[PDB]
């Protein structure tokens, strides 16, 4: 499946420090395009990518109205969650939600998502059928019963199969120069002696988009999974990502090691040596 759209909401209570903060961000693939922050001087859904800027006043006002209503609903859900977990009004808690759609090359729905967490733990999730729910505990089962009774899954399904995919397709067209462009990694290997007996080989991937990438070191053709230090893929700040993979190698054995790089922007996987 070739593209995704996702919305992420975070609602954070802070007793004694006002009403719970609500932050929303939207992404197409690994590109953020909107944000909303209830703490901002003047909260609105605001652009974060150039290709969304062309949307008219009706779009922005509608998205802002939705975010404000959502902030209010999540403030109520934070109060409900207290009751469901027998918790006091004195503590700080967080609800998170992620939802959206994946589409294949032909733009048809590949799959839909809608998942909730409470205090960083799974709470309830819409199943892949877009029709039933998986509740993580007895509290979430209470919500599940309410949502079954009210046919909430059908509402999500209608959005995910309809508006979600239609708007994703629109954004992909409006942002075709960037959203439909993969930037392959610029790769190299660096060598850092640590002693007379050992050296680090570090395989670098820089300037790539999207973030998904595989970096693997082989010794004599065998993957060194257990012995490779891999850093988390990290943003450069210019839309692209960086990653490295390192192995500690006996001095004089450097040529027995090969770094292998797979990425969507490459015609074929790369093999590097120092």
């Amino acid at each position: 499946g070739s593209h995704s759209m996702r919305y992420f909401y975070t609602a954070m209570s802070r007793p004694g420090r006002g009403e719970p903060r609500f932050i929303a961000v939207g992404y197409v693939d690994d590109t953020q395009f909107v944000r909303f922050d209830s703490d901002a001087a003047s909260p609105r859904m605001a652009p974060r990518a150039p290709w969304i800027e062309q949307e008219g006043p009706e779009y922005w006002d509608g998205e802002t109205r939705n975010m404000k209503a959502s902030a209010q609903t999540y403030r109520e859900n934070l109060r409900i969650a207290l009751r469901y977990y027998n918790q006091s009004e004195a503590g700080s808690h967080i609800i998170q939600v992620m939802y959206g759609c994946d589409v294949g090359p032909d733009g048809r729905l590949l799959r839909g998502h809608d998942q909730s967490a409470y205090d960083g733990k799974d709470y309830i999730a819409l199943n892949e059928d877009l029709s039933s729910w998986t509740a993580a505990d007895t509290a979430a089962q209470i919500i599940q019963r309410k949502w079954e009774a009210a046919r909430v899954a059908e509402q999500l399904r209608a959005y995910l199969e309809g508006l979600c995919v239609e708007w994703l397709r629109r954004y992909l067209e409006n942002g075709k120069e960037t959203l439909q462009r993969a930037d392959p990694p610029k790769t190299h290997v660096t060598h850092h002696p640590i002693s007379d007996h050992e050296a680090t080989l570090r395989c670098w991937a820089l300037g790539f988009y999207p973030a998904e990438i595989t970096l693997t070191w082989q010794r004599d053709g065998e993957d060194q999974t257990q012995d490779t230090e891999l850093v988390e893929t990290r943003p450069a700040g210019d839309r692209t990502f960086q990653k490295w993979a390192a192995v500690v190698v006996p001095s004089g054995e450097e040529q027995r090691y090969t770094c292998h790089v797979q990425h969507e922007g490459l015609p074929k996987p790369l093999t590097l040596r120092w």
Partner: peptide
């Protein structure tokens, strides 16, 4: 475009 149900689901 964000999901915008008539009634936003409550826990």
């Amino acid at each position: 475009k964000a999901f915008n149900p008539e009634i936003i689901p409550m826990f």
